[PDB]
């Protein structure tokens, strides 16, 4: 026969075939445990990504709300005309800063919501 020469070499021991039935060097429970450990440790990336996403979503809200409250405090406290004249320019700067943050959020959201497939 063609393959009888090779298949004559394949004759095993009782202990050999018991060891193969149990799969000593081919199941590798230590490898299974290492895989489980690495897979569970890989859950930190989801937390990182959600933190980044929520920050980029609230960035314009912060720029619009807390600096707005600060400007509102200053408006409530100021009375004269010189300080108000100087504060108008701060308000315009805050406008530009808000639009900058909105552009940045647009950028980060198109980065974070782009999928290949």
């Amino acid at each position: 026969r063609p393959g009888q020469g090779s298949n004559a070499q394949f004759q095993t021991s009782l202990a050999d075939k018991t060891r193969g039935l149990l799969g000593v060097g081919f199941l590798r429970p230590t490898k299974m445990a290492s895989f489980a450990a690495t897979f569970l440790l890989n859950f930190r990336f989801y937390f990182m990504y959600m933190a980044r996403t929520t920050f980029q979503a609230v960035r314009p809200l912060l720029a619009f709300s807390v600096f707005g409250e600060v400007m509102k405090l200053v408006l409530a406290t100021m009375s004269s005309g010189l300080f108000s004249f100087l504060f108008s320019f701060v308000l315009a700067f805050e406008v530009f800063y808000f639009f900058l943050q909105c552009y940045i959020s647009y950028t980060f959201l198109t980065m974070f919501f782009t999928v290949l497939f």
């Binding site: 095993t12 021991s13 050999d16 060891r19 193969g20 039935l21 081919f26």
Partner: protein, 122 residues
């Protein structure tokens, strides 16, 4: 040193012999009995093998199900039948009336059947 590293290699391959024998036994006992037939195999070929065969196609994220719809750009004379043309002529614009009616109905249902909430009484 020579002695020791040579004998090290010797029983390295001894362990290799043991591994090969148990590998053979594992295979011919378990895996040749548990091997799948091949009827329910994967119905596709990897893109690398297709690329080497000269078989891979990349295009058409979309498709056209019907031949009537496939041959439209090749017919050049009747892209649409007359009946189809008059049927298409009914959708030159979106229907704001139907949008309004369906939206009002859905708002009514969502508000007065699904979003009912309790109120105090004095």
């Amino acid at each position: 040193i020579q002695h020791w590293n040579k004998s090290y290699e010797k029983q390295v391959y001894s362990e290799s012999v043991a591994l090969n024998r148990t590998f053979q036994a594992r295979n011919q006992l378990v895996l040749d009995r548990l091997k799948p037939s091949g009827a329910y195999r994967l119905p596709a070929v990897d893109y690398k093998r297709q690329l080497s065969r000269g078989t891979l196609v990349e295009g058409a994220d979309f498709y056209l199900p019907t031949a009537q719809e496939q041959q439209r750009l090749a017919r050049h004379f009747e892209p649409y039948s007359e009946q189809e043309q008059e049927e298409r002529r009914k959708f030159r614009f979106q229907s704001i009336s139907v949008y309004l009616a369906v939206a009002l109905g859905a708002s009514f249902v969502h508000d007065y059947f699904y979003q009912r909430r309790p109120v105090a009484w004095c």
